[PDB]
């Protein structure tokens, strides 16, 4: 429960120290996504107009079957999170 599983996960420290996650029920499952970077979320590629990014969590969306599972998992990874109340 209180184990610092982030110590043996292998993920970088910024998920714990800098990035903030959101727990929300969008309409039957609970999801976890990450708030965008203030800078570096997107920037237009000068060559072909592609959308560049340095956010490696931009496409990651965890799914959970209960509200309890989403909160328990986020705590187990030491994530900074806020719950978006439905």
């Amino acid at each position: 429960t209180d184990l610092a599983k982030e110590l043996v996960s292998g993920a970088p420290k910024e998920l714990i120290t800098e990035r903030v996650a959101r727990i929300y029920q969008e309409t039957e499952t609970w999801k976890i996504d990450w708030d965008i970077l203030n800078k570096g979320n997107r920037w237009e590629n000068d060559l072909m107009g592609y959308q560049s990014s340095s956010d490696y969590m931009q496409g990651t969306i965890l799914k959970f079957d209960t509200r309890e599972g989403a909160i328990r998992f986020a705590k187990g990874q030491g994530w900074d999170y806020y719950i978006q109340e439905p």
Partner: protein
């Protein structure tokens, strides 16, 4: 079949005293093979600096309390040791390991867009 050189069988230690001894034994093995790491990987630093780097990594996990985290940390530390001694890591990876390392003020980050 036979295991590779310097391979240890995985075991879940249930005694903090026994875990502490296993950590100290492994820490000695890192120090003893430090001169070997400089030889195989052709590092540009003395073995004395390598031993200092080893101690820092062991000092990071000095105050880990939970036993289950100790076993996973110990198991991963053994795998890394078997990787270094057997020369499985390529020399570029070990050179970059020693390449690792004052934060700017609010205004300084504000000017350049911050993080």
């Amino acid at each position: 079949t036979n295991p590779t050189a310097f391979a240890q069988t995985t075991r879940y230690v249930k005694d903090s005293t026994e875990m502490r001894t296993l950590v100290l034994n492994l820490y000695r093995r890192y120090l003893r093979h430090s001169r070997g790491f400089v030889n195989n990987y052709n590092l540009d630093i003395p073995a004395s600096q390598v031993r200092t780097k080893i101690r820092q990594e062991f000092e990071r996990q000095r105050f880990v309390k939970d036993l289950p985290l100790k076993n996973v940390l110990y198991m991963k530390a053994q795998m890394e040791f078997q990787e270094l001694v057997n020369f499985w890591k390529q020399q570029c990876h070990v050179m970059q390991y020693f390449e690792s390392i004052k934060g700017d003020s609010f205004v300084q980050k504000f000017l350049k867009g911050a993080q």
